Structure formats: C-alpha cells, structure tokens
Amino acid sequence: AWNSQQIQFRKKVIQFAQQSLISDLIKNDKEEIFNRDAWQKCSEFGVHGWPIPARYGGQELDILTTAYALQGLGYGCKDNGLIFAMNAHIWACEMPLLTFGTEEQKEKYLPLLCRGGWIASHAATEPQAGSDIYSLKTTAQKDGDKYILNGYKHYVTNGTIADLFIIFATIDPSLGKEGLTTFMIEKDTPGLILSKPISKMGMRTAEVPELRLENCEVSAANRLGEEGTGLAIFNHSMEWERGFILAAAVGTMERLLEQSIRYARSHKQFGQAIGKFQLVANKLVEMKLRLENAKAYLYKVAWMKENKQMALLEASMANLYISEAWVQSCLEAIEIHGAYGYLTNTELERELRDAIASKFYSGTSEIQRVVIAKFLGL
Amino acid sequence: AWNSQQIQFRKKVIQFAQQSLISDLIKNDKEEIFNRDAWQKCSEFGVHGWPIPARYGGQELDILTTAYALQGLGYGCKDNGLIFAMNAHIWACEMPLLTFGTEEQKEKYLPLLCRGGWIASHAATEPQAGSDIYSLKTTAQKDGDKYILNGYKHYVTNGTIADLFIIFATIDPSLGKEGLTTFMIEKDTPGLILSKPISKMGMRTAEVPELRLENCEVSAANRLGEEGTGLAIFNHSMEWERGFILAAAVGTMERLLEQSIRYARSHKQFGQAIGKFQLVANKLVEMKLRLENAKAYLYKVAWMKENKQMALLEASMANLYISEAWVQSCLEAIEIHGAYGYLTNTELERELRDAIASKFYSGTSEIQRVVIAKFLGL
Amino acid sequence: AWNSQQIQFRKKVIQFAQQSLISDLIKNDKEEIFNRDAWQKCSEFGVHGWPIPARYGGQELDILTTAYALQGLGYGCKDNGLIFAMNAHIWACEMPLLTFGTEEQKEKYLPLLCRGGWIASHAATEPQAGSDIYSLKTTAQKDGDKYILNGYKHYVTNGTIADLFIIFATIDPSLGKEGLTTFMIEKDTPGLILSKPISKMGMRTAEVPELRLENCEVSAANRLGEEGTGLAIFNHSMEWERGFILAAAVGTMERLLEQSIRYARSHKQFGQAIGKFQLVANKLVEMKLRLENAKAYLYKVAWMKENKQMALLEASMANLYISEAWVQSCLEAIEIHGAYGYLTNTELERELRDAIASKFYSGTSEIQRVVIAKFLGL
Amino acid sequence: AWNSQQIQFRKKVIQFAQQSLISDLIKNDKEEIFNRDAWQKCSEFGVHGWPIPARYGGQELDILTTAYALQGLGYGCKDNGLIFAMNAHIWACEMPLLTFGTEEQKEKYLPLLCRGGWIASHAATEPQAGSDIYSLKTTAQKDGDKYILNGYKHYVTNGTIADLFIIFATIDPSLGKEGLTTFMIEKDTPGLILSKPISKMGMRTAEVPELRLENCEVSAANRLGEEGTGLAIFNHSMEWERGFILAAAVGTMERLLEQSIRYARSHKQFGQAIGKFQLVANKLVEMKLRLENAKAYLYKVAWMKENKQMALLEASMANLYISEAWVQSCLEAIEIHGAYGYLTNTELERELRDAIASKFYSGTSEIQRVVIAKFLGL
C-alpha cells in the first residue's frame, strides 16, 4: 500500500546510509565511539526534522512515511547505537516540545534540535524510580520567576553530548502524579553534573552517563507546560517512544534475514546447502513470520498517530513484540552461521548485544505486559 | 481503517449469528449432528455468495469485506464445524469453479451452490497422497466423450451431504504433476461410493466420510479446465483455502479473549480477582498479542487477493500462524477457568478440540513451513 | 540403577496390564464407563497395597520400586481414568490414614482399602476454595462425642463409588489455617448428598461428582488427627499426590514415544519415511528429552520419600513438569500421525484429552509455580 | 545422595576458587587475557588429574565425584573461559589418550598434562568439515616409520599455548569414515603453523586460533590407536566432551539463581520487592526447574561413564539441554536486574556472552538433535 514517492524516498534513505554513513564499526563498538560525523550527515539529510513541521525547520513528513523511511534507515545503517541515540532525541525530546511547548519555546529550541546541531536528552528515570516513574524524587522548588532543581537521574541517553536536557521533576512529592513537572535545562547550567558514559553490553556507540542536579536554577520560561502537566508530557512521550524507537530495528531484522538466507543457500555441509536441512530452514521461516508481524505492529501505530488517535496500547504492544522478536531473530542468525556467527569480525554478535537494550529502554517487557493488562480491563 | 458500511455489515452478521443460529451445541457435538437448518439460513443471508459475482446469484462483495464479515461470523457463531463445512464449500469448490470453469459450467453449477441449497465437496487427498498430493493414484481414462474414474479418496468434507464433487484425478500417472486433471461429478452417479462420516476429536458437526470411485463415468463437459490443468486448479484453491478458512477462527479467538477477561475479573481467589495475579493476566496479554497478529495475517491476504495478486506465501503464513495461535489461546482459556474449563457444560473444551483440526486441514503446519522455505529461496 | 527384582516386577506389571486389563476404551470413554472389573483385578494383583505395610494387608514395597512399577502400569494400561482413580485412592486417602491414623483407625480402614474392595475419596476443594484451600467454608461443630458437618465440596474423585470419604473441614472459620480438621465419613451416612458424575473433556472413565453435607454426624473416633491438624494432613497428602499421581503418566509418555517412532519409520511421503524430515524427527527428539526429564523428577521424589524426607518442593516441581510434558508430547504424537491422529478410532486424541486433567488436579501449574517461588524465598 | 566426603571436597573446591582464583575479570574479558596463573594453581590443586589414575600422576577420582567437584568449580570460579580451556584439555585430550594410548604413550604424555604444566589441544574441525566431521580433508601420508601431515584446522582451543596437539587426519580420503586416524604432535614441530587467537563474543579468556599443517612429520609411535581407529577415538572423545564440558556451567547456573533471588528480594519498586510480582518470580521458578534438570542430565552421564557404559546418547542429551538452559537462565538473570543487568560492571552480560559458545563447541544444538534421532531409529 506504499506509493511511488514512499518507495523512492526509502530507497534514497537506504542508498544514503549505505554510501555516506560507512564507519569502522568493530572499532567504534569495542572502543565505545559515538559517530558525531554520521549524526551531522543525518541531520543534513533531514532525519531529525522528519516528523517536525517545516515552520521549525522540519521536513513535515507524515508518520507512515517517517516510519517507512526509518525502517529503510535501519536496513541501510549498521550502527544501532547511532539509530537509538537519534530516536531518543526525536521521539522523547523534540515530540513533547512540539506538543506541549509555547510558540516562543518552540521557535527558540525546535529549529536548533531540527537543523542547528543541538542534541537533546530525556532525563526521567532514577535509582528508585525506573518502572515506578511516578515515584520521582527530583524536586523543583519555586523562587519567584525561577525553580531550584535537586535530584539524581541514572541512564541519560546523549547526556555527555546534549545541549538541552528534558527533565522530569516534582513541585511537591506529597501530590504524587499530580506534582510532576517538566523543565528544559541548557548544557553548562550551574548545578548540572554529568558522569562519564557507563559501559554496557551493546549500544556502545550511544553515550549513556548519570546525571546529578545540585541546586540547578531554571527560569519559569523554560518550564515545559504548566505545573502538574509532567505526567501528561511523559505519557505522550512514551506513546512516540515505544511506537517509533524500534521502527529502524524492523529494518535491521530485514537485513539479517537476507544475510542469513544468503548463508543458508551458500554454506554447504553433507553435500548440500545448510538451508536444505529443515532445522536450518525453519529458523528463517520463524525470522520471516516475526519480520511481517513487526511491520504490522509498526504500521498500525504509525497510522493511528497520523490520524491523531491515542495509541499507548498499540505502542506498548509494538515495543513488547519488536524488542523480543529482534533478540530472537539475532540469536537465530548466529545459530544459522554456526561458530562463524560467534566471531567478532562477522558482526552478528554485536547485533544481538544491541538488540537486548530494547528490552530495557522505553520500559521493560514486563511493564508493557502490565500496561496491556490494564487496557484489557484487569 | 474499516468504513461505516463494513462496521455495520459485520455487526449485522454477528446479530444474525447470535439470534437465528442458536443450537444445542453440547448435544450436536456429542451426537455428531450437522446443522442443516443453520446452513440453509446462512445461504438465505448470503454467506455462500459473499465472494461470488451477482450474475451467478452471488453478493459480489470485495475480499476485505468478506474476511471482515467472516471474522464477525466466527465471533457470533459457536458452531465451528458448520463454519468449517461452509468455508470448504466456498473456497475449495465455488472459487476454482468461478476461476477455471467455462461460461456454461459456471451458469449451471454456480447459481445452485449460491442459492439452490446444493452442497459441494473437494476430494483430492488419498491414503498414500496427503502432503505429497502430486503422487495421486486416482486415474481418469478417456473413452470418447466420457472419462472412467477409479480410485479412493479419504477425508471428504461434506461428502455424505454433497450434491457436487470436485475430484482431482490423473489421465496418465507417468506424467506426474502434468497429468493432474479436475472433474465435477454429481451426487449418486453409478460408481460414487461413500462411507459413514468418520468420528473425530472436534469439528463433529461437520461430516467427513471416505470416498471410493468404481468405474465412475463422467462427461468431458463436466471436466474442470483442460487435461493437465489440475495442478494449477489445486494451487489456486489452496491459496483461497489457506488464507480464508481460518478468517472465522480469528472471530472465535476474539470471543474467547473477552469471555476469559470477564472470568479473570469475576472469579475471586485469595481475596482478589484472579486477573490481579500476573500469571493469569499474562495469559490474556498473550491472547491479545496473538489476536492482533492473526488479524494482520488475515487482512494482508485479503488485500493482496482483492488487488488480484498471487498470495500463496501470505496464505501459508496466515494458515500456519492462525491455526497454532487458535490452539494455544484455546488451551489458555481453559487454564484461566481452572478445573471449571475442563467440564463439558462450560464449552471451552470443545473450542480446543475444534481448533486442532486447523493444524491438519488446508495442509499441516510442517507443510506450510516447507512452502515458506521454498518462497525464501531454499 | 534398577536391580533384577525391580526389572522383573515391572515386566510382570506390564504383562498383567497388557493381558488381563483389556477394555473397549473407545466405548468406555464415549459412554463414561468406570471399569470396576479392572479396579478389582488391580487390587487382587496388589497395586493398592504397594506402599502399604503387610500388617494392614499391603505389599510393603519401597517407594522407588512402587514408582518404577506404577510407570510400568502406565505403559501397559491404556485406561488413564482408572489409573487416576486408583492413584487418588492410594496417595490422597490411604497415605494420610497410614501416617496420621491411630492403631484402631488403621486396623479398621486400611485393610479394607487394600484388599476389601473399599474405595476412598478425598473431598477438600470448594467453589470458593480451590487454589485458596485454607479458606474452607465446610464447618464441623462438636456436640459432645460427635461433630456436625455442613458444607459443599465440588470435584470429588470416586465419590459415586466410594465407601469412605476423607473430608477437610473447619472447627472455627475465625482460626482459618489453624482451624482445619480431617474427618472419615462412611458412605450413606445421613446428610452426605452426592450428585451425578460430572461430564468432562478426558478422564471420562473416572467418576467425579459433587458433594453436599447437610448436618452430617460423625463420631470423634472417626476424626483423623487432633483438632487443627488438618493443614499438616493436607500438606502431607499433597506431597504424595503431586509426586506420585503422574508416575504412570511417565509410562504413558514412553508408550506414545515408541508408537510415534514406529509410525515415523513406517509411514512414507515424498518417497521416504516421514522421520527422514527433520521437522518430524525433532518432535520425537523433544518427546525423548521430556521422557528422561520426567523420569528424573519422579525418581528424585521417590528417593526422598523412601529416605523419610519432606519433599513438597520436589513433588511440586515433578507435578508441574510432568503434567505439561505429558500434554505437549500428546499434541506432538497427534501431529506426527497427521489427520490420522485426529480420528477417534486411532485413540491418540483421547490421550491428549486425559493429559489436560493433570494441569488441574493436585493443583494448577500456576499454584505449583507460586509454591516453588515461596520455597526459593520470594 | 552425596556423602560427607563429596560435600566436603566440593566445599573445598568452592573455597579454593573463591580465595585463590581472584582475577580482574572485566579487564581480562575486554583485553582477551588467558589466566596462566589460575591454570597453574588449578593443576597444583589437582583439577586436571581428577579423572586420571594416580599411576600417571592423577587424582583418580570417580566420575560422579569429578562431576560434583566440577559443579563446585563453576560456582566458585567466575572465569568461564578458563573453565572451558581446562575441560577441553581434560575431556578431549587426556581422556582419549588414557583409553586408546599404549603404555609407553600414556607413561610419557599423561604425567606431563596432569602435573608438568603441559597444555593440550584437540584439532578435528575444518572449514569444510564442522558438523560433517567424516569429510575431513587433512591427509596423513606414510613414509616407512613416519607420516606426512597436510591440512587446515580452524577453531583449535588452547592452540597458541598448547604443548601437545591431538590431530584427526585421514590416511586415504577415498576410505571416508574408515580412513580416519589420530596423531599426537608436539609444539614447535616443523610444519605446525598457528594464527593469532580469534576474537569472539564470549569465552575471551580462552585462546582459540587457527592451525595449518605444511608437511608436518610425525613418528608412527606418536599415532594414537591403529590406522582407521580415528572415528572410534573421536566418538569416545565426544562422549566425555558433551557430557562433562558443561558440568561447571551447572555450577554457574546455581550462582546466577542465588544472585537473582537476592536481587528479587532486595530491589524494590511500587512499594514492594520485585519478586512479589509473578512475572519476576516466575523467571526464578524457571531458573530453578532448569538447574534441577541440568543436574539430572549431568549425573546420569557421570554414573554411566563410571559404570563403563557407552553414553553418547546421554552425553548428547546433556549437552543439548544444559547449553540451552544456560543461555536462557543468563538472559533471565539480566531481565530480573533490568537496565542494571545490561551494564559491563554488573558482569551478568559476560555470563550470557560466554553461555552462547556452548551452543557451538562439542557440536551444535541441531547436530545433537540429529544424533538423538539416529539413536531413536530415525
């Protein structure tokens, strides 16, 4: 059901990613190197501005085209960490700003994230507030026209390279859910303390440090939405995050399937291609079923959000399905290749290491299941 | 993405099935009773004529509407055996006749199946030719204007009540695939021998006897397609069968999900509803994920066939997914209800017994996997 | 690790079951007929007396030999309902009586259950006390030397044919878990009301009616253990039940594996035996792995109980594993046979229907998981 | 069923591993450092000599004690790569030498491997002969009292540090299976070329380079067994390898279970410990079931090999079960910990990376399934 414009644009995205995004991935993964050159090239192409209206220097593309192009990006670009870093910037930072920001807030910050080279971070999670986000301890005390922010935020994607921080704090912890408020703090604000990026299994080309706020002053002008709107901002941010952060992962799944079919047809054992044995062929049949199901979950959310509908249930189902489908297909691709798929220089192992992250960011598999159960009535 | 006409027609199908299809299903399943009254009422409604053009007395509905209305029928009608019996008549008999039949063959036989109360059977499988259907032994020898048919066909859905038989035979077994030819034989033709309907686990309200042909004479005018076209006719009829026979099963899955949510909310243990325990709620979360995936496989095939595309791969993926998804969801519905779900009077047990059949008719799960692997290039 | 005596005795059990237990199983399952003739022959052989001391007319066999012989019984006897009915009588009735009964209680009832043709029932479960068994509503009011019992017990295996009833009641519901008490009530005691046996999916050759107590008088002499000991009696009964009710199911699993290997080697398709296709062969590989794991869980509990140890965790792990392993292997046996495995006259379908019951009696799969989690410290 | 001396010896093994095997595992894994100091300490303790008779400087333990002590080593030692490197040396090199070697071959080489600090490698696999091991191309041409070896062996565990090489070659490729012969070649023999150790996902503390033989001369005295015995030697080598290489992995599984229980009880969310949520507690119930099953498969093989029985089927079942059980339990341990389990410094991520290797060494999961199917008669 994709038109000529959509086929050609995705084909243009794949070609761009295959030609002008080449990196020494074995080295960048091992050494934990974020590709700033590739981020800059993607922004020049328009990746960041894809769901953003043209009045804020965006590309003003429809959601279905944005999701289709992202899938193309995932297929063409092997750097999964870069893809994750950009999606965090787009869906968890640019989107809530576009929806809840005032005309002056949007006119100042959106063109910068869009075209300017400014990077954004979403800092909401805390050591005792991961799954239980509502139980945030980061307080924001009003002092006339300003706010004094104090707290600790662990896991802040892009933190060490971010120019603007989207922070979820509370005006009063007694209020609970009703006390949650969002603040936009620029990089190098006195009181904003960052750690060195934390070492992890995969997504090593994406910088994830810790953040600490020690009497961090912010004007009431940089507060996103009214006092107490923080919950509505977070729930809206998760809708875009859960449903779209894994759009490119579907593309990666398509690349691994074609690579595995090629190997199952090429590699021979017992006088025949490995794919001639049903135990090998079935792994590719399972990879195919998962890929088509992932596309279905992605395109339903994309359609719903384009038709201005509330799709938290659909985004949760998409994130739960695609994250697990991705890990499983990666595991099977390594199996098809045998011992060869376990070697560093093959690069299939990195794919699995990166895939696991998706089971933790945007919420755990168990959280999505709890969210789905609530929507069923339970 | 369904229009007002589609929502209203499916709602009309559910209401019709809930009001005018009421049967003593515990009794009819136990005693193996085929509901002729309900078959007649469905034909009066237009079920049989749904994919048939209005010129042959059909409804001339588009495939996507036909599939949506079928999902509605499955939700509203509890008689899974009747649903299977009708889908076998529509997709494996009416469809190949509409596609490969001459104007005179269609004008004679199609209006009868639509509105005449004529029932059709598809007899292709044999004791030594189930999965290996190309290895058919049923021979057809030409004698001027006629053909003398000899063979044995096991598993003939609707056989004991059919008025017209769609038979897959061979002109010369040496030719193999190129020798396969189809014949339309009317009920009670000298040489057409039927057994008593065979007793099975589920689908007990659908008559499945054995067939024997002892020098069965048939005119060359009643031969569907040219000599050797039988393979093309079978492959076409599988495409429609695999993709659409389980359209109603998706509806049944929707009914059991809502029935299980109601029970998980109603039934209490340890001072709370069972659905408050995550091990119970997760079974409903799995039922929800499977239901949405089943809809996706069904609607892709429906779209493709409507847009006149060859969808054997998509029909095989749909039949493989939906048949297993149904059995699994049926098993979980019994689990949610506990020992209560194991009792005859609850009716959830019959649902599982009926669901298993889907793993054997239209081809086994293993056959679909082999078919998918071939389409992948293995 | 089995000696000559153990090999020969099991071989003697198989031969006995294969020669003198022959029944019209298709008919008895369809018509719901309990085989009293086979129950009598098993008692004459000594089955019921296997874990019982010779002084109470038992066989005085060690647990490991008892479990090995019961596996042999499961392999040789096709009537799964009879096997379930006998195991309920042995483990849930004879065992708590042997452990908690006084000399006079043992001397009177045990020889009768062993060789007297007396059948016993275990009535503990209630409509609002299934999984939450401690929340029993059946009250027992003391009136000098007697007790007045009032309540309702659903699912009472052997109820319609039992001579002695093992009833779990409460002296005071305010005490809860500390108020539980066990009573032995003889058949046809004024106030003991039984329903017709309830119709179910499988285990149709085992009678499971409902029980109602309306001012049922019982002597303090027929009270098993002291007041408040009911919990200890139930927990002890569950150890023997969970760990040994499925000992014969392991034997049934061995029979279906060899039956399926024979079919996979005999039945041919595409010019070779079906077992030559890896998707068919893998089902038997899975059946083999499950059979060996089931033996391991069964023999661990048998050893522990033989060495007078508390094995509730091990019995729960055995019942959870074996019940699910049995259902899964039954489904695969039907799959290997194709449409043939779905027919009533084949008998593989009945196996699956019987196997499901194991997921509900002796506690549900979810309950076992909860029990295991508590033992782990969670 | 373990006695006081077996409990005490395993406890002594755990204490030794916990106190005198401490390494900078995050660094060694990242930098690919083999711990020679820990290998030396293990040999001083007697690890290598455990299944070796005291005559050849061994410890002469019974297999059941050896397996129990290896389980203890896996629990106490976190360096999975060292454990794999040692098990490769014991089971694939020392064991075939003990069984097939002459008195002079055993007297010279066994005391060295056992107590001399000599390391051994098993080189059988080739680029065109992995699963299809019979199709070896490495030729051995006789020249009176010597043999000229030519070929290429990929994946040679311990190759870069080995003093003795166990090589599988062919006297005549036309003979196939009947032409297979084993040779013992000492390190630095002209013609023995080794590559740099290959970089892989996990097991990074174990050196796995490639090997090339260019007119490598070896005496007929250093030929293990007679000409054509190579298959019997390999299949005997696979019995010990498959059944005992994963004995320590069972210990690792026990460590991760206790570590995960501690975290599920300690870590709190939504006002309670995470283990109070059934989706978390079930991962630990599954970890428990898998651990007990792994112990059962390990102890069956250990018993059979102690009682001098052919256990290739049992070793294949053990390898297939344990390797998959290990990967799954590692994945779940990371899930229980959330994002915390994905960090390098947590060390759970390395456990999973190491676990995957087990699905490729000693044969792939698919190969074991094929081996099991052959034993069943398919």
Ligand SMILES: Cc1cc2nc3c(=O)[nH]c(=O)nc-3n(C[C@H](O)[C@H](O)[C@H](O)COP(=O)(O)OP(=O)(O)OC[C@H]3O[C@@H](n4cnc5c(N)ncnc54)[C@H](O)[C@@H]3O)c2cc1C
């Ligand atoms: C309720 C019901 C109604 C039916 N109605 C009709 C009807 O009206 N008309 C009609 O023509 N047919 C009908 N059939 C037949 C049906 O399509 C068969 O179940 C199907 O053709 C499979 O044949 P089989 O069961 O004989 O199994 P087999 O084909 O004998 O195969 C045996 C087993 O081996 C496996 N196997 C076989 N070949 C391969 C392979 N190449 N690769 C891997 N595994 C393989 C399969 O998984 C199967 O389990 C009906 C069947 C049922 C159950």
Ligand SMILES: Cc1cc2nc3c(=O)[nH]c(=O)nc-3n(C[C@H](O)[C@H](O)[C@H](O)COP(=O)(O)OP(=O)(O)OC[C@H]3O[C@@H](n4cnc5c(N)ncnc54)[C@H](O)[C@@H]3O)c2cc1C
């Ligand atoms: C064939 C048969 C014979 C029987 N014979 C006897 C007999 O002789 N004597 C006797 O006393 N009983 C007998 N029973 C009763 C049997 O033990 C029950 O099936 C069992 O007690 C649980 O059944 P239930 O559905 O009433 O549980 P329910 O309490 O109805 O549970 C409903 C569902 O919720 C889930 N659930 C409930 N509580 C929890 C929890 N805490 N955590 C997680 N999930 C939970 C369960 O998974 C279950 O599926 C028999 C049952 C059967 C099927």
Ligand SMILES: Cc1cc2nc3c(=O)[nH]c(=O)nc-3n(C[C@H](O)[C@H](O)[C@H](O)COP(=O)(O)OP(=O)(O)OC[C@H]3O[C@@H](n4cnc5c(N)ncnc54)[C@H](O)[C@@H]3O)c2cc1C
């Ligand atoms: C860490 C490590 C250390 C090793 N150390 C040694 C060592 O010291 N000495 C040594 O000799 N070897 C060693 N090996 C080699 C190891 O045993 C191989 O992984 C194994 O032999 C499988 O070969 P392969 O990976 O080449 O895959 P292949 O054999 O090429 O097969 C490719 C794929 O096809 C499938 N397949 C192949 N044949 C069949 C079939 N008949 N039926 C079904 N599916 C099939 C398999 O599942 C596999 O995934 C080591 C391997 C590893 C990973």
Ligand SMILES: Cc1cc2nc3c(=O)[nH]c(=O)nc-3n(C[C@H](O)[C@H](O)[C@H](O)COP(=O)(O)OP(=O)(O)OC[C@H]3O[C@@H](n4cnc5c(N)ncnc54)[C@H](O)[C@@H]3O)c2cc1C
């Ligand atoms: C690569 C990466 C990048 C990230 N980037 C960001 C970022 O930029 N900004 C940001 O704000 N956050 C970020 N996060 C945090 C991320 O969203 C967390 O992984 C998520 O919040 C869960 O964190 P947790 O493991 O602390 O959860 P925990 O709350 O510690 O959960 C512990 C375990 O218990 C289970 N559990 C907990 N509660 C329940 C329940 N109610 N029901 C059932 N099971 C339950 C969960 O399954 C989990 O496995 C990032 C995480 C990762 C891994």
